[PDB]
Amino acid sequence: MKGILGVKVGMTRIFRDDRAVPVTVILAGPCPVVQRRTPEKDGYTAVQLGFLPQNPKRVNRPLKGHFAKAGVEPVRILREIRDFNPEGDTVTVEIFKPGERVDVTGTSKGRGFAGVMKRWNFAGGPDSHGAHKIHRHPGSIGNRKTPGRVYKGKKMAGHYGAERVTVMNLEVVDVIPEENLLLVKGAVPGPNGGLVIVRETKKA
Amino acid sequence: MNRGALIKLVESRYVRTDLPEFRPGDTVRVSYKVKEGNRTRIQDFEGIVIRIRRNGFNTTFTVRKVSYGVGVERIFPLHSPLIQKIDIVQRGRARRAKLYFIRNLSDREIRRKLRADRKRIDQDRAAERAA
Amino acid sequence: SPGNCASCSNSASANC
Amino acid sequence: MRHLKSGRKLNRHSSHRLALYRNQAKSLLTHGRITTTVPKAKELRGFVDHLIHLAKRGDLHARRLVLRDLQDVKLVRKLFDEIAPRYRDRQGGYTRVLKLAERRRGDGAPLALVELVE
Amino acid sequence: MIQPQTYLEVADNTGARKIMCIRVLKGSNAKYATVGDVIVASVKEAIPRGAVKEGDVVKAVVVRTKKEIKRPDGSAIRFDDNAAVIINNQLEPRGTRVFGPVARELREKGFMKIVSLAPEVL
Amino acid sequence: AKHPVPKKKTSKARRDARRSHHALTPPTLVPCPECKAMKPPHTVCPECGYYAGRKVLEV
RNA sequence: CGAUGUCGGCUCGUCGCAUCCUGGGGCUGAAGAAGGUCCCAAGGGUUGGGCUGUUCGCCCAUUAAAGCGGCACGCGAGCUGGGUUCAGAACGUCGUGAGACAGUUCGGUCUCUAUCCGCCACGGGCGCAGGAGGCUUGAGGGGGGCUCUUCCUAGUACGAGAGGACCGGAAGGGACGCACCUCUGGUUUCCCAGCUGUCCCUCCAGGGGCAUAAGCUGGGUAGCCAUGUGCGGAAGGGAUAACCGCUGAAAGCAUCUAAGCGGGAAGCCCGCCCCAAGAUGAGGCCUCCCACGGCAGCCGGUAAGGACCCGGGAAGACCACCCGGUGGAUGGGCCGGGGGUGUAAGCGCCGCGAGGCGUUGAGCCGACCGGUCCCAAUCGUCCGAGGUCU
RNA sequence: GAAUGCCGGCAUGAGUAACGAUAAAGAGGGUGAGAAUCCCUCUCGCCGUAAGCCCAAGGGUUCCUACGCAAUGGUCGUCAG
RNA sequence: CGUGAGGGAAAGGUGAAAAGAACCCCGGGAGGGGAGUGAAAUAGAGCCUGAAACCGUGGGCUUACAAGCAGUCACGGCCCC
Ligand SMILES: [Mg+2]
Ligand SMILES: [Mg+2]
Ligand SMILES: [Mg+2]
Ligand SMILES: [Mg+2]
Ligand SMILES: [Mg+2]
Ligand SMILES: [Mg+2]
Ligand SMILES: [Mg+2]
Ligand SMILES: [Mg+2]
Ligand SMILES: [Mg+2]
Ligand SMILES: [Mg+2]
Ligand SMILES: [Mg+2]
Ligand SMILES: [Mg+2]
Ligand SMILES: [Mg+2]
Ligand SMILES: [Mg+2]
Ligand SMILES: [Mg+2]
Ligand SMILES: [Mg+2]
Ligand SMILES: [Mg+2]
Ligand SMILES: [Mg+2]
Ligand SMILES: [Mg+2]
Ligand SMILES: [Mg+2]
Ligand SMILES: [Mg+2]
Ligand SMILES: [Mg+2]
Ligand SMILES: [Mg+2]
Ligand SMILES: [Mg+2]
Ligand SMILES: [Mg+2]
Ligand SMILES: [Mg+2]
Ligand SMILES: [Mg+2]
Ligand SMILES: [Mg+2]
Ligand SMILES: [Mg+2]
Ligand SMILES: [Mg+2]
Ligand SMILES: [Mg+2]
Ligand SMILES: [Mg+2]
Ligand SMILES: [Mg+2]
Ligand SMILES: [Mg+2]
Ligand SMILES: [Mg+2]
Ligand SMILES: [Mg+2]
Ligand SMILES: [Mg+2]
Ligand SMILES: [Mg+2]
Ligand SMILES: [Mg+2]
Ligand SMILES: [Mg+2]
Ligand SMILES: [Mg+2]
Ligand SMILES: [Mg+2]
Ligand SMILES: [Mg+2]
Ligand SMILES: [Mg+2]
Ligand SMILES: [Mg+2]
Ligand SMILES: [Mg+2]
Ligand SMILES: [Mg+2]
Ligand SMILES: [Mg+2]
Ligand SMILES: [Mg+2]
Ligand SMILES: [Mg+2]
Ligand SMILES: [Mg+2]
Ligand SMILES: [Mg+2]
Ligand SMILES: [Mg+2]
Ligand SMILES: [Mg+2]
Ligand SMILES: [Mg+2]
Ligand SMILES: [Mg+2]
Ligand SMILES: [Mg+2]
Ligand SMILES: [Mg+2]
Ligand SMILES: [Mg+2]
Ligand SMILES: [Mg+2]
Ligand SMILES: [Mg+2]
Ligand SMILES: [Mg+2]
Ligand SMILES: [Mg+2]
Ligand SMILES: [Mg+2]
Ligand SMILES: [Mg+2]
Ligand SMILES: [Mg+2]
Ligand SMILES: [Mg+2]
Ligand SMILES: [Mg+2]
Ligand SMILES: [Mg+2]
Ligand SMILES: [Mg+2]
Ligand SMILES: [Mg+2]
Ligand SMILES: [Mg+2]
Ligand SMILES: [Mg+2]
Ligand SMILES: [Mg+2]
Ligand SMILES: [Mg+2]
Ligand SMILES: [Mg+2]
Ligand SMILES: [Mg+2]
Ligand SMILES: [Mg+2]
Ligand SMILES: [Mg+2]
Ligand SMILES: [Mg+2]
Ligand SMILES: [Mg+2]
Ligand SMILES: [Mg+2]
Ligand SMILES: [Mg+2]
Ligand SMILES: [Mg+2]
Ligand SMILES: [Mg+2]
Ligand SMILES: [Mg+2]
Ligand SMILES: [Mg+2]
Ligand SMILES: [Mg+2]
Ligand SMILES: [Mg+2]
Ligand SMILES: [Mg+2]
Ligand SMILES: [Mg+2]
Ligand SMILES: [Mg+2]
Ligand SMILES: [Mg+2]
Ligand SMILES: [Mg+2]
Ligand SMILES: [Mg+2]
Ligand SMILES: [Mg+2]
Ligand SMILES: [Mg+2]
Ligand SMILES: [Mg+2]
Ligand SMILES: [Mg+2]
Ligand SMILES: [Mg+2]
Ligand SMILES: [Mg+2]
Ligand SMILES: [Mg+2]
Ligand SMILES: [Mg+2]
Ligand SMILES: [Mg+2]
Ligand SMILES: [Mg+2]
Ligand SMILES: [Mg+2]
Ligand SMILES: [Mg+2]
Ligand SMILES: [Mg+2]
Ligand SMILES: [Mg+2]
Ligand SMILES: [Mg+2]
Ligand SMILES: [Mg+2]
Ligand SMILES: [Mg+2]
Ligand SMILES: [Mg+2]
Ligand SMILES: [Mg+2]
Ligand SMILES: [Mg+2]
Ligand SMILES: [Mg+2]
Ligand SMILES: [Mg+2]
Ligand SMILES: [Mg+2]
Ligand SMILES: [Mg+2]
Ligand SMILES: [Mg+2]
Ligand SMILES: [Mg+2]
Ligand SMILES: [Mg+2]
Ligand SMILES: [Mg+2]
Ligand SMILES: [Mg+2]
Ligand SMILES: [Mg+2]
Ligand SMILES: [Mg+2]
Ligand SMILES: [Mg+2]
Ligand SMILES: [Mg+2]
Ligand SMILES: [Mg+2]
Ligand SMILES: [Mg+2]
Ligand SMILES: [Mg+2]
Ligand SMILES: [Mg+2]
Ligand SMILES: [Mg+2]
Ligand SMILES: [Mg+2]
Ligand SMILES: [Mg+2]
Ligand SMILES: [Mg+2]
Ligand SMILES: [Mg+2]
Ligand SMILES: [Mg+2]
Ligand SMILES: [Mg+2]
Ligand SMILES: [Mg+2]
Ligand SMILES: [Mg+2]
Ligand SMILES: [Mg+2]
Ligand SMILES: [Mg+2]
Ligand SMILES: [Mg+2]
Ligand SMILES: [Mg+2]
Ligand SMILES: [Mg+2]
Ligand SMILES: [Mg+2]
Ligand SMILES: [Mg+2]
Ligand SMILES: [Mg+2]
Ligand SMILES: [Mg+2]
Ligand SMILES: [Mg+2]
Ligand SMILES: [Mg+2]
Ligand SMILES: [Mg+2]
Ligand SMILES: [Mg+2]
Ligand SMILES: [Mg+2]
Ligand SMILES: [Mg+2]
Ligand SMILES: [Mg+2]
Ligand SMILES: [Mg+2]
Ligand SMILES: [Mg+2]
Ligand SMILES: [Mg+2]
Ligand SMILES: [Mg+2]
Ligand SMILES: [Mg+2]
Ligand SMILES: [Mg+2]
Ligand SMILES: [Mg+2]
Ligand SMILES: [Mg+2]
Ligand SMILES: [Mg+2]
Ligand SMILES: [Mg+2]
Ligand SMILES: [Mg+2]
Ligand SMILES: [Mg+2]
Ligand SMILES: [Mg+2]
Ligand SMILES: [Mg+2]
Ligand SMILES: [Mg+2]
Ligand SMILES: [Mg+2]
Ligand SMILES: [Mg+2]
Ligand SMILES: [Mg+2]
Ligand SMILES: [Mg+2]
Ligand SMILES: [Mg+2]
Ligand SMILES: [Mg+2]
Ligand SMILES: [Mg+2]
Ligand SMILES: [Mg+2]
Ligand SMILES: [Mg+2]
Ligand SMILES: [Mg+2]
Ligand SMILES: [Mg+2]
Ligand SMILES: [Mg+2]
Ligand SMILES: [Mg+2]
Ligand SMILES: [Mg+2]
Ligand SMILES: [Mg+2]
Ligand SMILES: [Mg+2]
Ligand SMILES: [Mg+2]
Ligand SMILES: [Mg+2]
Ligand SMILES: [Mg+2]
Ligand SMILES: [Mg+2]
Ligand SMILES: [Mg+2]
Ligand SMILES: [Mg+2]
Ligand SMILES: [Mg+2]
Ligand SMILES: [Mg+2]
Ligand SMILES: [Mg+2]
Ligand SMILES: [Mg+2]
Ligand SMILES: [Mg+2]
Ligand SMILES: [Mg+2]
Ligand SMILES: [Mg+2]
Ligand SMILES: [Mg+2]
Ligand SMILES: [Mg+2]
Ligand SMILES: [Mg+2]
Ligand SMILES: [Mg+2]
Ligand SMILES: [Mg+2]
Ligand SMILES: [Mg+2]
Ligand SMILES: [Mg+2]
Ligand SMILES: [Mg+2]
Ligand SMILES: [Mg+2]
Ligand SMILES: [Mg+2]
Ligand SMILES: [Mg+2]
Ligand SMILES: [Mg+2]
Ligand SMILES: [Mg+2]
Ligand SMILES: [Mg+2]
Ligand SMILES: [Mg+2]
Ligand SMILES: [Mg+2]
Ligand SMILES: [Mg+2]
Ligand SMILES: [Mg+2]
Ligand SMILES: [Mg+2]
Ligand SMILES: [Mg+2]
Ligand SMILES: [Mg+2]
Ligand SMILES: [Mg+2]
Ligand SMILES: [Mg+2]
Ligand SMILES: [Mg+2]
Ligand SMILES: [Mg+2]
Ligand SMILES: [Mg+2]
Ligand SMILES: [Mg+2]
Ligand SMILES: [Mg+2]
Ligand SMILES: [Mg+2]
Ligand SMILES: [Mg+2]
Ligand SMILES: [Mg+2]
Ligand SMILES: [Mg+2]
Ligand SMILES: [Mg+2]
Ligand SMILES: [Mg+2]
Ligand SMILES: [Mg+2]
Ligand SMILES: [Mg+2]
Ligand SMILES: [Mg+2]
Ligand SMILES: [Mg+2]
Ligand SMILES: [Mg+2]
Ligand SMILES: [Mg+2]
Ligand SMILES: [Mg+2]
Ligand SMILES: [Mg+2]
Ligand SMILES: [Mg+2]
Ligand SMILES: [Mg+2]
Ligand SMILES: [Mg+2]
Ligand SMILES: [Mg+2]
Ligand SMILES: [Mg+2]
Ligand SMILES: [Mg+2]
Ligand SMILES: [Mg+2]
Ligand SMILES: [Mg+2]
Ligand SMILES: [Mg+2]
Ligand SMILES: [Mg+2]
Ligand SMILES: [Mg+2]
Ligand SMILES: [Mg+2]
Ligand SMILES: [Mg+2]
Ligand SMILES: [Mg+2]
Ligand SMILES: [Mg+2]
Ligand SMILES: [Mg+2]
Ligand SMILES: [Mg+2]
Ligand SMILES: [Mg+2]
Ligand SMILES: [Mg+2]
Ligand SMILES: [Mg+2]
Ligand SMILES: [Mg+2]
Ligand SMILES: [Mg+2]
Ligand SMILES: [Mg+2]
Ligand SMILES: [Mg+2]
Ligand SMILES: [Mg+2]
Ligand SMILES: [Mg+2]
Ligand SMILES: [Mg+2]
Ligand SMILES: [Mg+2]
Ligand SMILES: [Mg+2]
Ligand SMILES: [Mg+2]
Ligand SMILES: [Mg+2]
Ligand SMILES: [Mg+2]
Ligand SMILES: [Mg+2]
Ligand SMILES: [Mg+2]
Ligand SMILES: [Mg+2]
Ligand SMILES: [Mg+2]
Ligand SMILES: [Mg+2]
Ligand SMILES: [Mg+2]
Ligand SMILES: [Mg+2]
Ligand SMILES: [Mg+2]
Ligand SMILES: [Mg+2]
Ligand SMILES: [Mg+2]
Ligand SMILES: [Mg+2]
Ligand SMILES: [Mg+2]
Ligand SMILES: [Mg+2]
Ligand SMILES: [Mg+2]
Ligand SMILES: [Mg+2]
Ligand SMILES: [Mg+2]
Ligand SMILES: [Mg+2]
Ligand SMILES: [Zn+2]
């Protein structure tokens, strides 16, 4: 189960065998390992990865001692890849070669307070034929005296997006080790500049 | 990082410079590699370009022609490797960047609006006097 | 409407 | 949503907001310093910085561009002849905003000064 | 992007002149038809003494659409009308000529006779 | 609508529990490095007119 | 009856299973294919249209299928108001009449503010025996769960022929779901241009206002988007249902069963995706501070840290979250690039003139990718451990 | 102790809805204990078969000036019918 | 209030005596703090007595794993006499 931290940079399309393949480009490595979770010590198996160098003038003493025991420069993000134990002490884009398939996890874009039609694709109301101030309204939310309440999990308005999303089984179209670049076919959650996690796929 | 530069870096392998410059209003012949049945030929599509939307490597352009009584618009990626070559056939002088208005015009109404870009025609003939 | 005069509850505005 | 959008709205429609910025431009470029609300102050910076920059360029085209917003020919003369030369070697940043420590009594609005720099 | 109520010109000599889609024959509930897709249609306008007359329920394959259609090579193509060719249950054209260009997507979907009878295949 | 309305008078306990979030927070004040008066940070001093070390406005 | 709003539609679901389809079966008057009938199964699915207020129903075109019921004939403090159902009017009919008719006909007021429970979201407080900054385990929840066509096997098995498979293997779809903006296609309230009338600046030229909350028109970046793009349903393991066995008595035979052991569903449990230690059963790991001064307690000064304030942010109603605060590229300006518009003004030349040509892809130029300390994040303040007991 | 009782007082809803045409504002300078709101100047916008002017009815000192701001003014007020 | 006929309120109390608080202080004023009057000033004119709802300040006890017509019975803890 290989994985690596990265930043989404943006999308384009390349040409491969007279086909245009939409790609999103990810700057993955290099990811130093700063702690290993062992079954003896922690109860599971994972690597805590670091990513992106940080101004030591910004890193407090508790964190600075965590990096010290690792022998690692201060870094902006720590994330674990579960069930991943790399041989080296540095993980780079070259753990993927073109043709492989990955799952990419990001923070989706945040719509704030989303109405019922954007959040849940409700049908709204009519826009004429007498419709009275309910054009984007959700309609009924229940029954009557039985059960005289509203189901937990009822689809209603509220905050939407800015949440963890994994999109799965993305073809790795290319890797450019010289630049820590990772091209992947399709779309990836979140904005340009967002932090993403790239993991070997769980589909078969 | 510089995210814009990295994307330009990714695209650089695919950028083309062999193709000639043109402008909306220019009549043009795109020699294009199509696949049919089992083999691949080169099909020419000749028409007026009515639009050039620019996004660097991702720029595309739209070419309009009338075929056997029917309007046909074709959108090409400017850096597509399926484009063998582009022949300028004529230079027209447009007044605006997008020429959708010619869709609702007769053949003579178009000829009156898009007259020969005499200036850039002389620029073409002045070039190709390279010796 | 209840409202008008065939029914008489739940359904229209002030008049009384 | 509002993602990556530039430009305050200031609860004015399109033509009122443009009038709002032009009138502060005239007042700032007349008195060298004015007091407004902090949000208005912050938006003024850009609008006047561009006018001053054109004054630094000095050509007739620049003057006519500046005239579209400022209108007053005398005022444009002051900007071209007396204001712009103060900034010949300044790479932008011809205005500053500093926050005032008290508010309006009648609506609690937070106040600021916008002034031309030296 | 043809759907029920959509009018289409007939690009053949079956005698039909205008047909109005009433089904896109693509599974349980397809919303739209594109080039290559078969529709059921009512013949709203036909020339006298043709093979088909007004009011007939016919089948037809869509050959040109005004919505542009995209291609794996990154290009697209778009026509100035929506046009169809009337067919029989073996997908063969019911007339003997077809008029105007047709989209190359027909060849893939298996409408070989229409492609060859077409004056231009774009 | 059908004009919703409070079912029961709110108890003294409940009305006051609603207001457990209403206390003002005191103004945040720093000493002015020039005249030592207490003033809001990041504002020109209203007592002596100084900011960033220099005189900026008439008091 | 000091009011429990009355049909239907729309919207939003959710449940039952007497199952319409899809999955698994036994019997068949099951050759194959396709049916019939019964059993198991509620995971998911169950189209668009013409008529009518209609529910229902009939009909058209499709489909794997176009299921039946409950939830106050689900749902009017969610909408509608066609029907029903006041007052007007008329027809047929009844009545001498006034009037009357689950008979018909045309018309006919549907109430801005949610206290409590519930529901969707988001915080504040305290707690989790020292106080802190990080990274996590997943108890327990939730989401999802669909299906078709063609081809190969193979024109094989089967059948006189017509027709035509099981098993196994490929390819391509429909609807739905999540994310996304490279492309396609929208918007793009001032990013650019053209245009009319009028008033104005300053007479010409050049401009500004107003004509909408853009005067109108042609375009249009980022963003937000679907019509566009990627990806999903699984696979796989386990335990089962009907059903089929192995071995096997009671009962010398027989029996799937009484001892024991197999096989076996789209369903059940895992697996996938998301939430999650207020999981008070308050978990775990890494790192940091530490024995402060005064009579499980008190008041103070601090430690590690945090907050306040400020510059902001594809984060956001406020709050929260995230980044930055001069040892700084956080916003604003400026510069370069991108992008849009499509050749500014001024001048020169041709024309009586409207205009035209050149200077010139010029000029203008939001957000996008960057650089640059020019401007502003000055200066600071206040909280904050000394660790209860066998 | 109850009469949807009568009179009065005070609560709840709640710091909630609202503050009455979407013609629109900005700065500077004054006055003052106090100013988004009063005065003055400049800029901006709105009406212009009126949102300008003159009669009639109705109203009845609301007119002018000085001095005032408790209440009236949907905020404020140094201003004002 | 109603065009009119006509309908039709609310509102009493300083003290024996104004001796009704000079003067000083903060405040623009209102208001208060001293001084002073009085047997009495929570008799200070918003004045005899001054109940209740209602609102607030201070203190004791108590409360953030808990199911409630709010009480009642028991025991325990803390506080007070
Ligand atoms: Mg982009
Ligand atoms: Mg490649
Ligand atoms: Mg970061
Ligand atoms: Mg992200
Ligand atoms: Mg992440
Ligand atoms: Mg986000
Ligand atoms: Mg999105
Ligand atoms: Mg909605
Ligand atoms: Mg939607
Ligand atoms: Mg959305
Ligand atoms: Mg959605
Ligand atoms: Mg959602
Ligand atoms: Mg709808
Ligand atoms: Mg609909
Ligand atoms: Mg709609
Ligand atoms: Mg509407
Ligand atoms: Mg209505
Ligand atoms: Mg409504
Ligand atoms: Mg409406
Ligand atoms: Mg609703
Ligand atoms: Mg009810
Ligand atoms: Mg109901
Ligand atoms: Mg219940
Ligand atoms: Mg959020
Ligand atoms: Mg998700
Ligand atoms: Mg795949
Ligand atoms: Mg790189
Ligand atoms: Mg980019
Ligand atoms: Mg032509
Ligand atoms: Mg011309
Ligand atoms: Mg020319
Ligand atoms: Mg009523
Ligand atoms: Mg929104
Ligand atoms: Mg909006
Ligand atoms: Mg920005
Ligand atoms: Mg703007
Ligand atoms: Mg507003
Ligand atoms: Mg407003
Ligand atoms: Mg306003
Ligand atoms: Mg407002
Ligand atoms: Mg306007
Ligand atoms: Mg001044
Ligand atoms: Mg001011
Ligand atoms: Mg202001
Ligand atoms: Mg000049
Ligand atoms: Mg400009
Ligand atoms: Mg400041
Ligand atoms: Mg302040
Ligand atoms: Mg005030
Ligand atoms: Mg006020
Ligand atoms: Mg034709
Ligand atoms: Mg024909
Ligand atoms: Mg005929
Ligand atoms: Mg006919
Ligand atoms: Mg593509
Ligand atoms: Mg035909
Ligand atoms: Mg041919
Ligand atoms: Mg309503
Ligand atoms: Mg209403
Ligand atoms: Mg109401
Ligand atoms: Mg009640
Ligand atoms: Mg109560
Ligand atoms: Mg109480
Ligand atoms: Mg209380
Ligand atoms: Mg409460
Ligand atoms: Mg209290
Ligand atoms: Mg509140
Ligand atoms: Mg407080
Ligand atoms: Mg009743
Ligand atoms: Mg009642
Ligand atoms: Mg009742
Ligand atoms: Mg009632
Ligand atoms: Mg009721
Ligand atoms: Mg059953
Ligand atoms: Mg059952
Ligand atoms: Mg049965
Ligand atoms: Mg079945
Ligand atoms: Mg079956
Ligand atoms: Mg069977
Ligand atoms: Mg038999
Ligand atoms: Mg048979
Ligand atoms: Mg069979
Ligand atoms: Mg089911
Ligand atoms: Mg169920
Ligand atoms: Mg069902
Ligand atoms: Mg139907
Ligand atoms: Mg009809
Ligand atoms: Mg209908
Ligand atoms: Mg019906
Ligand atoms: Mg019914
Ligand atoms: Mg019926
Ligand atoms: Mg019938
Ligand atoms: Mg079937
Ligand atoms: Mg069937
Ligand atoms: Mg039902
Ligand atoms: Mg029932
Ligand atoms: Mg149902
Ligand atoms: Mg019933
Ligand atoms: Mg009934
Ligand atoms: Mg009902
Ligand atoms: Mg129903
Ligand atoms: Mg209603
Ligand atoms: Mg109803
Ligand atoms: Mg109902
Ligand atoms: Mg209801
Ligand atoms: Mg109701
Ligand atoms: Mg109700
Ligand atoms: Mg009605
Ligand atoms: Mg009606
Ligand atoms: Mg009706
Ligand atoms: Mg009827
Ligand atoms: Mg009669
Ligand atoms: Mg009789
Ligand atoms: Mg009789
Ligand atoms: Mg009679
Ligand atoms: Mg009746
Ligand atoms: Mg009747
Ligand atoms: Mg009836
Ligand atoms: Mg009858
Ligand atoms: Mg009858
Ligand atoms: Mg009737
Ligand atoms: Mg009738
Ligand atoms: Mg009518
Ligand atoms: Mg009626
Ligand atoms: Mg209303
Ligand atoms: Mg509430
Ligand atoms: Mg309740
Ligand atoms: Mg908190
Ligand atoms: Mg909390
Ligand atoms: Mg602990
Ligand atoms: Mg600890
Ligand atoms: Mg410890
Ligand atoms: Mg922490
Ligand atoms: Mg953090
Ligand atoms: Mg976890
Ligand atoms: Mg679990
Ligand atoms: Mg729980
Ligand atoms: Mg589960
Ligand atoms: Mg579920
Ligand atoms: Mg399933
Ligand atoms: Mg075969
Ligand atoms: Mg075989
Ligand atoms: Mg044979
Ligand atoms: Mg055969
Ligand atoms: Mg098979
Ligand atoms: Mg579903
Ligand atoms: Mg979605
Ligand atoms: Mg997006
Ligand atoms: Mg883009
Ligand atoms: Mg786009
Ligand atoms: Mg586009
Ligand atoms: Mg502009
Ligand atoms: Mg004009
Ligand atoms: Mg004009
Ligand atoms: Mg002129
Ligand atoms: Mg004007
Ligand atoms: Mg006007
Ligand atoms: Mg206007
Ligand atoms: Mg209009
Ligand atoms: Mg304009
Ligand atoms: Mg436009
Ligand atoms: Mg457009
Ligand atoms: Mg755009
Ligand atoms: Mg875009
Ligand atoms: Mg979007
Ligand atoms: Mg779509
Ligand atoms: Mg098994
Ligand atoms: Mg046997
Ligand atoms: Mg046996
Ligand atoms: Mg057994
Ligand atoms: Mg077994
Ligand atoms: Mg077996
Ligand atoms: Mg499945
Ligand atoms: Mg089951
Ligand atoms: Mg988590
Ligand atoms: Mg915990
Ligand atoms: Mg956790
Ligand atoms: Mg917590
Ligand atoms: Mg528990
Ligand atoms: Mg506990
Ligand atoms: Mg505990
Ligand atoms: Mg514990
Ligand atoms: Mg813990
Ligand atoms: Mg653990
Ligand atoms: Mg410190
Ligand atoms: Mg903010
Ligand atoms: Mg916030
Ligand atoms: Mg905020
Ligand atoms: Mg910070
Ligand atoms: Mg600092
Ligand atoms: Mg700091
Ligand atoms: Mg910066
Ligand atoms: Mg910058
Ligand atoms: Mg800003
Ligand atoms: Mg450029
Ligand atoms: Mg360009
Ligand atoms: Mg020119
Ligand atoms: Mg020029
Ligand atoms: Mg010129
Ligand atoms: Mg001349
Ligand atoms: Mg010209
Ligand atoms: Mg340009
Ligand atoms: Mg510029
Ligand atoms: Mg530029
Ligand atoms: Mg700019
Ligand atoms: Mg760029
Ligand atoms: Mg950036
Ligand atoms: Mg530097
Ligand atoms: Mg300080
Ligand atoms: Mg009694
Ligand atoms: Mg009551
Ligand atoms: Mg009574
Ligand atoms: Mg009473
Ligand atoms: Mg009373
Ligand atoms: Mg009363
Ligand atoms: Mg009363
Ligand atoms: Mg009284
Ligand atoms: Mg009362
Ligand atoms: Mg009261
Ligand atoms: Mg109370
Ligand atoms: Mg109250
Ligand atoms: Mg009250
Ligand atoms: Mg209140
Ligand atoms: Mg509030
Ligand atoms: Mg409320
Ligand atoms: Mg509110
Ligand atoms: Mg209100
Ligand atoms: Mg409000
Ligand atoms: Mg109002
Ligand atoms: Mg008003
Ligand atoms: Mg109006
Ligand atoms: Mg107003
Ligand atoms: Mg309006
Ligand atoms: Mg107007
Ligand atoms: Mg101004
Ligand atoms: Mg002002
Ligand atoms: Mg003013
Ligand atoms: Mg002023
Ligand atoms: Mg002043
Ligand atoms: Mg001064
Ligand atoms: Mg004022
Ligand atoms: Mg004042
Ligand atoms: Mg005003
Ligand atoms: Mg004035
Ligand atoms: Mg001025
Ligand atoms: Mg006039
Ligand atoms: Mg007058
Ligand atoms: Mg008179
Ligand atoms: Mg009067
Ligand atoms: Mg006066
Ligand atoms: Mg007053
Ligand atoms: Mg006042
Ligand atoms: Mg006053
Ligand atoms: Mg007075
Ligand atoms: Mg008075
Ligand atoms: Mg008042
Ligand atoms: Mg007032
Ligand atoms: Mg008022
Ligand atoms: Mg005064
Ligand atoms: Mg007066
Ligand atoms: Mg009166
Ligand atoms: Mg009366
Ligand atoms: Mg009177
Ligand atoms: Mg009376
Ligand atoms: Mg009385
Ligand atoms: Mg009294
Ligand atoms: Mg007395
Ligand atoms: Mg006495
Ligand atoms: Mg005194
Ligand atoms: Mg004084
Ligand atoms: Mg004094
Ligand atoms: Mg005064
Ligand atoms: Mg006094
Ligand atoms: Mg006092
Ligand atoms: Mg006194
Ligand atoms: Mg005495
Ligand atoms: Mg005595
Ligand atoms: Mg006293
Ligand atoms: Mg007393
Ligand atoms: Mg007394
Ligand atoms: Mg009293
Ligand atoms: Mg007495
Ligand atoms: Mg008393
Ligand atoms: Mg009293
Ligand atoms: Mg008392
Ligand atoms: Mg107390
Ligand atoms: Mg206390
Ligand atoms: Mg518990
Ligand atoms: Mg406790
Ligand atoms: Mg009791
Ligand atoms: Mg008890
Ligand atoms: Mg006991
Ligand atoms: Zn100071």
Rounded Cα distance between E56 and F11, Å, is: 76
Closest CA to D36 of D116, D114, D115: D114
How far apart are the CA of F13 and the centre of ligand 66, in A?
Answer: 9
Resolution (A): 2.7
Q: Which of A8, A25, A173 has the highest number of chain B CBs within 10 A, making it the mutation to test binding with B?
A: A25
How far apart are the CA of E68 and the centre of ligand 266, in A?
Answer: 91
Give CA separation, E46 vs E16, E24, E53, in Å. 4, 21, 6
For residue E86, how many other CB atoms are within 10 A of its CB? 24
Chains B and A touch (3+ CB pairs under 8 A): yes
Closest CA to E100 of E21, E14, E12: E12
Rounded Cα distance between A90 and A138, Å, is: 51
Nearest residue in chain A measured CA to CA from E75 = A20
Chains B and C touch (3+ CB pairs under 8 A): no
Rounded Cα distance between E91 and A168, Å, is: 39
SS3 assignment for chain A: CCEEEEEEEEEEEEECCCCEEEEEEEECCCEEEEEEECCCCCCCCEEEEEEEECCHHHCCHHHHHHHHHHCCCCEEEEEEEECCCCCCCEECHHHCCCCCEEEEEEECCEEEEECHHHHHCCCCCCCCCCCCCCCCCCCCCCCECCECCCCCCCCCCEEEECCEEEEEEEEEEEEEHHHCEEEEECCCCCCCCCEEEEEECCCC
Give the CA count within 13 Å in the CB-facing half-sphere of E4. Answer: 9
| Residue indicated by tokens 């329920």 | E57
Rounded Cα distance between E102 and E100, Å, is: 7
Strand H atom within 7 Å of D24 CB: yes
Residue B53 touches chain E, beta carbons under 8 Å: no
Closest CA to B75 of D13, E78, D84, F30: E78
Q: Is B128 left (phi over 0), alpha (psi -120 to 50) or beta?
A: left
Of B34, B37, B68, the CB nearest to E101: B68
Closest CA to E79 of E54, E109, E99, E57: E99
Are the C-beta atoms of residues D99 and D112 closer than 8 Å to each other? yes
Closest CA to B83 of B59, B102, B65: B59
Residue E47 touches chain B, beta carbons under 8 Å: no
Closest CA to A46 of A199, A163, A181: A199
SS3 assignment for B24-54: CCCEEEEEEEEEECCEEEEEEEEEEEEEEEC
Per the DSSP assignment, residues forming a β-bridge with D110 are D103
Residue B76 touches chain E, beta carbons under 8 Å: yes
Protein residues bordering strand I (Cβ below 7 A): F 12, 16
Residue B82 touches chain E, beta carbons under 8 Å: yes
Closest CA to A78 of A201, A169, A195, A202: A195
* DSSP-derived 3-state class of residue D14: helix
Cis peptide bond upstream of C3, omega within 30 = yes
Residue B68 touches chain E, beta carbons under 8 Å: yes
Residues in chain A: 204
Report chain A's terminal Cα–Cα distance, integer Å. Answer: 13
Task: Scan residues 35-74 of chain D and list those with Cβ within 7 Å of strand H.
Answer: 35-37, 40, 71-72
Mutual angle of helices D14-31 and D38-57, in 10-degree steps: 70
Closest nucleotide over all strands to F10 (CA to C1')? H12
For residue F52, how many other CB atoms are within 10 A of its CB? 8
Can you list the domains of chain D with their CATH numbers? 14-118 (3.90.1030.10)
How far apart are the CA of D117 and the centre of ligand 181, in A?
Answer: 64
